[PDB]
């Protein structure tokens with residue numbers, strides 16, 4: 416949504432139904448900034464999932480402020496279901512969560528009334544006080560699965576080797592350079608699509624072509640050779656043999672290299 | 684094309700047309716003019732014996748390249764060269780283009796050596812029409828005895844009954 | 850005319866000047882000239 420800022424015309428009343436001011440009443444919601452491992456962030460950030468379903472329970476034990484995640488069994492069995500939430504920052508300051516939303520575009524002292532502001536509907540969703548990281552519990556039966564997965568992260572290769580052609584070497588050179596095989600592809604066949612067009616123009620007679628030229632000069636005073644020729648479908652020799660008699664070309668003006676009507680006929 | 688013919692290494696018109704988008708009629712006119720003025724320069728300057736270097740057919744020089752393109756063994760290539768050499772004696776195909784003569788000799792020896800390549804694959808590789816290759820094989824089936832190398836069927840590497848009939 | 854031997858087939862071949870230098874049995878384009886028929890004297894010191 417491209418828009419112009421520094422509007423002293425109060426155009427935002429007419430072009431934006433929603434208010435441009437930041438909504439601030441949700442800023443008191445407590446937000447925990449949680450960092451996730453690869454598997455859990457993969458299964459918790461994809462948009463095809465996350466239909467509002469329950470993903471687990473949080474147990475906060477006041478004896479030592481131990482915060483644990485108790486995931487449900489519906490997702491997987493290889494991943495653990497008990498995670499130790501470590502608080503890397505008990506108190507987090509000056510960290511807020513704000514939203515971005517598209518608007519309703521339908522219905523010294525020196526200043527410049529143009530600053531190129533892109534307005535968006537914004538609101539503080541909440542305030543961040545607890546920075547968290549998720550580590551799986553050591554005693555979980557599926558923790559060794561996570562250790563094996565992290566070892567397999569650096570073990571497997573995502574790149575395959577170069578493919579070596581196993582057939583006879585002359586068969587590979589059947590298509591290369593010296594080849595009977597003409598290109599059946601239609602890629603960049605400019606000559607094929609340009610030589611198929613043929614503009615052929617008969618010698619229809621002098622009085623009719625000059626009447627047609629006068630009608631076209633009544634339509635527009637200045638004409639190019641190509642434009643007039645494609646408008647009348649006449650050969651360039653005959654068209655020139657009429658145009659020099661009935662008109663003239665411009666050599667120096669702003670409309671140069673254009674055939675325009677003679678000034679004897681311009682008044683008519 | 685003149686340079687290829689001069690070094691006994693001649694390619695065909697379709698090869699150079701595969702490189703250069705050249706119109707065939709004026710290509711032939713240009714080649715004829717260049718041959719005329721080259722013979723004139725040879726007569727005016729140093730004289731060169733042609734000894735079959737400007738030959739129109741040159742069908743013996745197309746067999747190894749086409750056999751390489753089809754990935755054929757060597758003995759199929761030499762048998763095809765012998766066949767195409769003896770195809771000149773046959774008057775029924777003496778007027779055919781050397782490309783088609785080489786292709787039908789190669790296909791005859793492919794069928795002779797039980798090389799598992801169809802006529803459609805040869806036609807796709809070398810752009811001789813499969814009808815043309817089939818007709819050439821049919822018209823060379825009557826002259827099986829002369830075309831096939833005698834010492835090959837003497838040594839038993841190939842036999843004349845391997846060729847399918849028409 | 851002159852005797853030649855292919856590089857790996859080791860079959861004796863006779864080549865004239867107009868013949869291309871290839872093996873009739875191998876097609877290997879490296880040929881070795883045959884050893885001379887004349888006797889060669891080596892002083893055994």
Ligand SMILES: [Zn+2]
Nearest residue numbers: 855858872875
């Ligand atoms: Zn050899």
